[PDB]
């Protein structure tokens, strides 16, 4: 009979749905069992990064006070089934919403989340092939076009998220002031005692050539962002094994 | 005719909402178009506005009943589709009468969520 | 709404020595080699480590006053407190250090002159000067002699030893 | 099932002119289609396709302006619709000022109702545009 | 060197650096390396039919850009 | 400025939004 | 001989595509091998190639039907298989008769695609 075949036909098709969505797992799993490494080496690479750009302001004068644009680089994967991270970093973005903020986000589903939402507050995003390792260039390419975007920016932000364990992945920020506010308040944190735990850093730097700090501003800048994108990477794979899991007891209720 | 459009609305709104569930059974309800979630959460208060309790079962569901006239279910509903109650909570629509009572449970859930709030920070 | 920084997740921090303060007499560099957001030695208890800034060579031991330094293409030496020499070579980066004894070098890329080969160099070096008689511009040549100043450094380095 | 292209921009609104609530005369029908056809439709949004056809049909924006030079083809002369099934639209007889007609009515509409549709935002002039296009649907 | 006058920023110096470094890795060990030195990222902006716009204000080939 | 010159239900509605909104916003302060 | 293993070649990449095609529509055509790819690019075209329009169904169809005989059906299936019409566009292989129609097909799509460019240029 055609409706008894209908339902074997229907239960067929799932039978390859569970078996082509467990082997996502299983490559997965090993994306997450390889990339596993850098929970151990992490942490011990920023370390001098956090003196020159470490600063807990308070989120509405930073904002509030935008006389330039705040172009913003946000991190999100080009692969979907990758859990709510795609959009919850779109919800971020919303919430600090502004005239001067503009977007440069990374990522397929970056290139095409923003894009819908704000067809102003867009220019372009990256689309990058995650065949390779994580490298150095890829970030050095991501800041030159930010700066490309609206080099007369008051700040480059990075929305990324950090793989805390297996099973939590927060939202974390990098804040990166241009050149000219950040010489300036490497210039305080010098001269006055505010600021002591960078007083000597900021003297530090103050004797070389500007070349030399404009290089430091440089190479820093990347390795922040060389520490997001190598962050969601971790973040994407263990959220594409904690909702594929999610989809592996809808696909046997069902 | 305002009666005609808004349940034509309704029902197209349910209808839509129907077929994306199946998606959101398997994947899940984050793989969706970021317009389609908005339908999703129209539909789902629109689902639970539905209900109604009855001053027949008053010992069943332990509430008191509601009468609704037909010009305030009419007049609720379609500011719903409108969108201009989108801020208000997904479980004030539930068990309720006409929109005031959403309303009025609504402030009540404000309330409560207030006072945890004030208990979290206070326990700083 | 806010977030938390991505620092306070990277809790290891540097230690800075009050300038006020009595002096310690130390017989260990604590080393940090890392490339690309990985650390090739962390926190290593080294005799001493020799790098190559646009300046020139400097020579790190314990006790090393404060500086900056900008590494050019170039190898970097690390001398063990046992008498073992360690010899990467780095295509740039960074080199800070501190006076508490610690000296963190971040490079974009160190590769142990131990994978590295000279015969592939010698044409390489062949090529990329042939290259750079047909590069179109003045911005396609400076880019050539980049290669070239490398590839130089790369030949030169492994002559030595 | 698999982008804004032409068959992609022409095919949802034929299905909007698909909704219907009463019978529609033939010269009324196949005139909507061909309009929509050609690409007469393309800068009418989705939504307004319905009050175009209305407009179309129960009136005539060229004589309303002052701009209607057709001799005959116009859309209040019902016996028009014998001829269009005699010689078809794509004949030179008709073919003429059929496009006149819906240019000049593109024209029009555009300019004179489109634009102020789109300038809507008091909530009063928001569900008074939403009661005229959903009566449209049941009148054309 | 002589790079900085024709505008080329230090962190395009140090890619070239980079590429060339492996270059030179022994053919058994540049495939680990050769991992880090592959530009295989590209822009594009919303175009608005729901295609894409390729806008690169940056070279993205390092060894020619 | 020459319309400067000469010139309950759903009041109801509208409070009660306000008061919910604003609790809802007040909440998110503190 | 020829017309045998033709045959099967041919069944058995419709039997692959149709494996595929669950993988498709689960990961998304992003995540297929280059080899899949190449199995799907040509596989859609024998599905759309063997598509033929019938001298009686013109009305049906409102085009010309097509007889195509037996030697051009094994020399143009045989070419598709081994990747000679890589390059030819997907579509041409829609409701036509032998390979010959299948390239002026081709020829005809890409005159009116200069021809749409041309209008946007002007544009
Ligand atoms: O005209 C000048 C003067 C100074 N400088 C630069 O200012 C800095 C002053 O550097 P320092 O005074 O701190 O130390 P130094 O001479 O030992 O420096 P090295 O050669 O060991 O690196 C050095 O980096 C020097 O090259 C110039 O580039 N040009």
Redesign the pocket.
């Given at each position: 009979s055609g409706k008894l075949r209908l339902y074997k036909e229907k239960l067929e098709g799932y039978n390859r749905f569970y078996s082509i969505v467990k082997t996502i797992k299983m490559v997965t799993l090993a994306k997450y069992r390889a990339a596993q490494g850098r929970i151990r080496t992490r942490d011990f690479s920023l370390r001098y990064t956090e003196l020159a750009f470490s600063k807990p302001q308070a989120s509405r004068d930073a904002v509030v006070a935008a006389k330039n644009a705040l172009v913003y680089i946000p991190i999100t994967t080009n692969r979907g089934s990758c859990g709510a991270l795609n959009s919850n970093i779109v919800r971020c973005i919303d919430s600090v919403v502004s005239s001067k903020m503009v977007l440069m986000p990374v990522g397929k589903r970056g290139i095409d989340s923003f894009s819908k939402l704000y067809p102003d507050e867009f220019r372009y995003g990256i689309i990058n092939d995650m065949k390779e390792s994580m490298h150095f260039g890829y970030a050095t390419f991501v800041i030159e076009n930010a700066y490309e975007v609206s080099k007369d920016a008051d700040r480059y932000q990075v929305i990324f998220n950090r793989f805390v364990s297996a099973g939590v992945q927060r939202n974390a920020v990098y804040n990166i002031p241009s050149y000219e506010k950040w010489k300036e308040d490497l210039a305080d944190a010098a001269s006055s005692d505010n600021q002591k735990n960078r007083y000597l850093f900021a003297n530090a730097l103050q004797?070389?050539?500007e070349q030399?700090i404009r290089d430091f501003f440089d190479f820093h800048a990347a390795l922040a962002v060389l520490n997001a994108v190598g962050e969601n990477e971790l973040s994407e794979q263990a959220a594409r094994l904690v909702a594929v899991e999610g989809q592996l007891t809808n696909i046997s209720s069902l | 005719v305002d009666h005609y459009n808004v349940a034509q609305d309704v029902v197209q709104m349910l209808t839509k909402y129907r077929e994306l569930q199946d998606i959101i059974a398997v994947l899940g309800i984050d793989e969706l178009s970021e317009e389609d979630k908005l339908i999703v959460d129209r539909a789902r208060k629109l689902v639970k506005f539905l209900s109604q309790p009855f001053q027949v079962a008053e010992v069943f569901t332990g509430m008191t009943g509601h009468y609704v006239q037909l010009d305030d279910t009419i007049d609720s509903f379609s500011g719903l589709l409108m969108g201009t109650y989108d801020q208000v909570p997904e479980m004030a629509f539930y068990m309720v009468g006409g929109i005031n009572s959403v309303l009025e449970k609504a402030k009540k859930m404000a309330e409560e969520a207030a006072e945890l709030e004030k208990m979290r920070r206070a326990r700083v | 709404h806010d977030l938390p920084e991505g620092f306070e997740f990277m809790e290891h921090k540097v230690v800075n020595k009050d300038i006020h303060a009595p002096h310690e007499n130390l017989e260990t560099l604590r080393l940090t080699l890392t490339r690309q957001d990985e650390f090739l030695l962390r926190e290593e208890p080294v005799k001493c480590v020799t790098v190559t800034?646009?300046?020139?060579e400097?020579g790190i031991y314990p006790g090393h006053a404060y500086?900056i330094?900008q590494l050019n293409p170039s190898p970097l030496t690390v001398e063990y407190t046992d008498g073992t020499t360690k010899k990467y070579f780095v295509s740039g980066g960074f080199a800070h250090i501190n006076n508490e004894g610690s000296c963190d070098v971040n490079t974009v890329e160190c590769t142990l002159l131990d994978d590295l080969d000279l015969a592939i160099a010698e044409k390489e070096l062949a090529a990329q000067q042939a290259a750079l008689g047909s590069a179109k511009d003045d911005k396609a040549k400076s880019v050539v002699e980049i290669r070239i100043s490398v590839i130089e450094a790369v030949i030169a380095a492994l002559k030595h030893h | 099932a698999d982008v804004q292209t032409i068959p992609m921009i022409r095919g949802a609104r034929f299905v909007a002119l698909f909704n219907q609530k009463q019978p529609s005369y033939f010269m009324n029908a196949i005139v909507s289609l061909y309009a929509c056809l050609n690409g007469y439709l393309d800068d009418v949004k989705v939504q307004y396709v319905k009050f175009y056809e209305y407009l179309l049909v129960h009136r005539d924006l060229g004589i309303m302006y002052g701009t209607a030079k057709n001799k005959f083809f116009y859309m209040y002369v019902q016996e028009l619709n014998y001829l269009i099934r005699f010689f078809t639209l794509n004949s030179p007889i008709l073919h003429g000022e059929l496009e006149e007609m819906l240019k000049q009515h593109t024209h029009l509409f555009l300019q004179h109702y489109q634009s102020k549709m789109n300038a809507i935002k008091s909530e009063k002039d928001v569900k008074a545009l939403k009661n005229l296009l959903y009566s449209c649907k049941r009148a054309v | 060197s002589s790079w900085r006058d024709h505008g080329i920023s230090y962190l395009k110096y140090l890619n070239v650096c980079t590429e060339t470094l492996h270059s030179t890795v022994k053919e058994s060990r540049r495939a680990k390396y050769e991992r880090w030195s592959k530009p295989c990222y590209t822009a594009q902006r919303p175009d608005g039919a729901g295609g894409q716009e390729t806008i690169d204000k940056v070279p993205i080939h390092t060894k020619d850009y | 400025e020459a319309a400067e010159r000469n010139p309950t239900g759903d009041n109801a509605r509208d409070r009660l939004l306000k008061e919910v909104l604003a609790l809802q916003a007040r909440i998110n302060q503190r």
């Open positions: 004797n070389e050539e030399l | - | 800034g646009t300046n020139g400097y500086k330094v | - | - | -």
